[PDB]
Design a binder for this molecule. Structure first.
Ligand SMILES: NC(=O)C1=CN([C@@H]2O[C@H](COP(=O)(O)OP(=O)(O)OC[C@H]3O[C@@H](n4cnc5c(N)ncnc54)[C@H](OP(=O)(O)O)[C@@H]3O)[C@@H](O)[C@H]2O)C=CC1
Ligand SMILES: NC(=O)C1=CN([C@@H]2O[C@H](COP(=O)(O)OP(=O)(O)OC[C@H]3O[C@@H](n4cnc5c(N)ncnc54)[C@H](OP(=O)(O)O)[C@@H]3O)[C@@H](O)[C@H]2O)C=CC1
Ligand SMILES: CCCCCCOc1ccc([C@H](SCC(=O)N(C)O)P(=O)(O)O)cc1
Ligand SMILES: CCCCCCOc1ccc([C@H](SCC(=O)N(C)O)P(=O)(O)O)cc1
Ligand SMILES: [Mn+2]
Ligand SMILES: [Mn+2]
Lengths: 411, 411
């Protein structure tokens, strides 16, 4: 009974890590079939992955490299995949009855589109992309209410940890990103752990002048550029607070960010009796990815065992909101609700990219995001799913444009 | 739907803590009926508990204070309990259809008797007593195989932690102290945490001359004298290694003792994928006791919330087997199997009591236990439950006598 999986964003950090744990898992016993691979424009790298995994489907988003892809794959003998392009290609893969689970390793708001179509096709969605949940949580909840057999299984490491800390006897009565989830699961409060990022010990004077080169250098594992910058600003953790709220139905007052620099405890769940359960491992994404594909079971691996005497010390401290103002902006946006999380995500996408490209300074990131949030006024939420998606898109686009306009003006 | 509970050993540390969380839990909403209280000889204290809780049944083990108990309880107006004595009284309570769950807070090998009769009556046994499991694990397993609806739910804090870390979706397919439990639950390895006791930082020269007064002073919560001495020698943790083996069907090579002096992580479970799940709270017995009575659910409490920034640091180190030789003796006994754990428990009961009463020195404890273990020869295991109990009793008694004889001889 092999598990038929598609990897969306297969050439990025998540996608390559997913293919690695799959490869390793299969050597112990052949449990996964890699049925589809989808990328944006990394045509040479997708070709190489195609030669190794020989999926039934290949898809490339950028039309300008589709012909190139076909020409390359011609060089793989005895291999006749279905080779698709763009939105229509993604939709065709999601509607295939040969695919059971889809790993969403596409970055940014863009990952919402495939997330939505995977749910609409009643698939198990092993969701790493958090911008989708932040920007469109209420929408996704409505979609999941309609598509009974669709499920989001969280891959983001902290949310995987939380999910692993739950009793599946209770989980199986509901599913993530549903009303009443915390009540059913007896959840009282979440400790959302953070690495703290590379800037965690810097002074205010030092933060003023940090660069994106400083944020990107010497990663534990290479993550994509966007998340790496968000880790440095701790906007990642702000996004993950909102993600927690939506996935697990936890009030913002019951989500506490804790800086745990060793990254061994990945997050913790306090139940209503005050007992706390936590998930622990070395800093890795292989367990989150694997668990999303095996849940509700676990399978044998040969991963390096955790050794607590080796670790020796685990530390916890609260983050400074003066140093990391993005965290507070995320809580404020989440608490306001409505489309404020959409605005938060969109403005951050622009500010993150500006800092990445050395156009603005560290504290300008939070300044831009704050100004966009203050400029937004709540809208009535469309009652129809199609209109609600259009409204999310329009607000996301406006907020990106507003961020860019603020940048353009101070120049 | 109140939960009908008996408290065995109601005047001791476990028993009084059980009555405290019950009392507190009932204020939030009335979920427990205290149906029976049983003690050895603490007749005045049992009377006081009777006046507060007004259980249907009262039992006192020591015949010489039974009349006194009756005379005292006469002073409680409008109260006509059933007042029993000894083994026959315990058996009558265990066979009552009005009792659903029994907390076993009786110390030492003596706690085996009520444990056995609670299982024979198909009850939920909230078992704090570990000497029963160490001395008679294979026997209890056979009994639990026959008595389908009987269950041991562990109360010992580390074993409660382990149990809490399991997925009830899998637990409910089996029960503790059963063959194949680890396979069903996907358990690979256990981290068995320890406080390390009051002697953890002493040198060999200092250990030579430690006293029982040193071991007993200034407890976090007052525990009984026997367990307190076993914590000081780390024989408690040796006993708990064997307890882990039997409760959870974990090989001794897959049980690792770790000294965690802050006592926040109560123990950890490594699953076959290498993910680790742990349970955390302040050092307390209220959660273990409560969970044993609410499992498979959890209920609301108003316990002090865990605060990780307050805790700040968690530490882990391996215990020194030179300083704490009892640990190694326990592993050796467990690995040999047969009745060696019975012998280990019995010899320790004598050696612990000798040290408590200032008759022997610290390293004489392990010396006596080691000599008794070396003197024992494996026996064929009786095939009949009744004969098997007689054989356990005979070996336990011999091993106590052998320990005392070794003491008597070196004097
Ligand atoms: N990296 C990590 O360990 C973690 C990541 N995440 C989340 O996972 C997501 C992915 O992050 P990460 O892997 O770091 O990002 P990367 O930048 O490393 O990878 C992004 C991937 O998405 C592909 N992609 C981009 N646009 C499209 C498109 N329109 N259609 C199809 N594929 C597309 C890229 O293709 P191409 O190569 O062709 O450009 C690439 O394969 C993010 O949402 C992030 O927050 C969460 C937890 C940790
Ligand atoms: N204290 C703790 O926090 C922990 C304890 N445990 C285990 O729990 C058990 C109890 O320990 P603890 O509470 O510390 O011990 P205590 O010495 O504090 O209490 C023992 C209790 O058992 C009663 N008792 C003794 N013999 C009999 C008998 N024949 N019939 C009925 N009752 C009897 C005693 O009655 P009386 O008062 O009349 O003498 C007393 O109520 C031990 O097996 C220990 O290992 C495990 C984890 C932690
Ligand atoms: C050896 C110790 C140092 C390990 C450092 C490597 O581990 C991490 C772990 C987490 C993260 C977070 S960003 C990525 C993410 O969201 N994930 C993995 O779920 P954040 O900084 O926001 O908490 C970054 C690095
Ligand atoms: C504030 C930090 C200091 C807390 C010290 C108080 O907590 C503990 C916790 C555990 C124990 C063990 S003996 C009792 C027992 O078996 N339990 C509770 O399950 P051991 O020493 O064998 O690990 C003793 C004391
Ligand atoms: Mn994360
Ligand atoms: Mn214990």
């Amino acid at each position: 009974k092999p598990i038929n999986v598609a990897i969306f964003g297969s050439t990025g950090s998540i996608g390559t890590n997913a293919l690695n744990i799959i490869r390793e898992c299969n050597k112990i016993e052949n449990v996964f079939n890699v049925k589809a691979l989808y990328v944006n424009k990394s045509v040479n790298e997708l070709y190489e992955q195609a030669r190794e995994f020989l999926p039934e489907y290949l898809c490339i988003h950028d039309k300008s490299v589709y012909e190139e892809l076909k020409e390359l794959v011609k060089n793989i003998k005895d291999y006749k995949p279905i080779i698709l392009c763009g939105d229509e290609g993604m939709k065709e893969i999601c509607s295939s009855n040969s695919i059971d689970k889809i790993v969403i390793g596409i970055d940014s708001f863009q990952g919402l589109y495939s997330t939505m179509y995977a749910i609409m096709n009643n698939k198990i969605v092993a969701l790493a992309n958090k911008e989708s949940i932040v920007s469109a949580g209420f929408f996704l909840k409505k979609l999941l209410n309609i598509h009974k057999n669709a499920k989001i299984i969280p891959v983001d490491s902290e949310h995987s940890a939380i999910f692993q800390c739950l009793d599946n006897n209770k989980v199986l009565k509901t599913k993530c990103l549903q009303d009443n989830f915390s009540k059913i699961n007896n959840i009282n409060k979440i400790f959302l752990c953070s690495s703290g990022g590379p800037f965690q010990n810097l002074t205010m004077d030092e933060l003023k002048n940090v660069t994106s080169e400083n944020a990107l250098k010497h990663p534990k594992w290479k993550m994509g550029k966007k998340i790496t910058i968000d880790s440095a600003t701790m906007m990642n953790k702000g996004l993950e607070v909102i993600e927690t709220h939506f996935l697990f139905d936890v009030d913002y007052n019951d989500i506490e960010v804790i800086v745990h620099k060793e990254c061994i405890i990945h997050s913790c769940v306090e139940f209503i009796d005050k007992s706390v359960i936590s998930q622990m491992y070395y800093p890795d994404m292989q367990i989150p990815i694997l668990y999303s594909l095996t849940w509700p079971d676990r399978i044998k691996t040969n991963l390096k065992p955790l050794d607590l005497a080796q670790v020796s010390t685990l530390t916890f401290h609260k983050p400074s909101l003066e140093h990391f103002p993005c965290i507070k902006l995320a809580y404020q946006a989440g608490i306001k609700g409505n489309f404020y999380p959409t605005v938060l995500n969109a403005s951050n996408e622009i500010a993150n990219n500006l800092f990445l490209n050395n156009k603005i300074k560290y504290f300008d990131i939070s300044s831009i995001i704050s100004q966009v949030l203050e400029s937004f006024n709540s809208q009535k939420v469309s009652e129809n799913s199609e209109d609600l998606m259009k409204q999310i898109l329009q607000i996301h686009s406006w907020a990106k444009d507003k961020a860019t306009d603020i940048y353009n003006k101070h120049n």
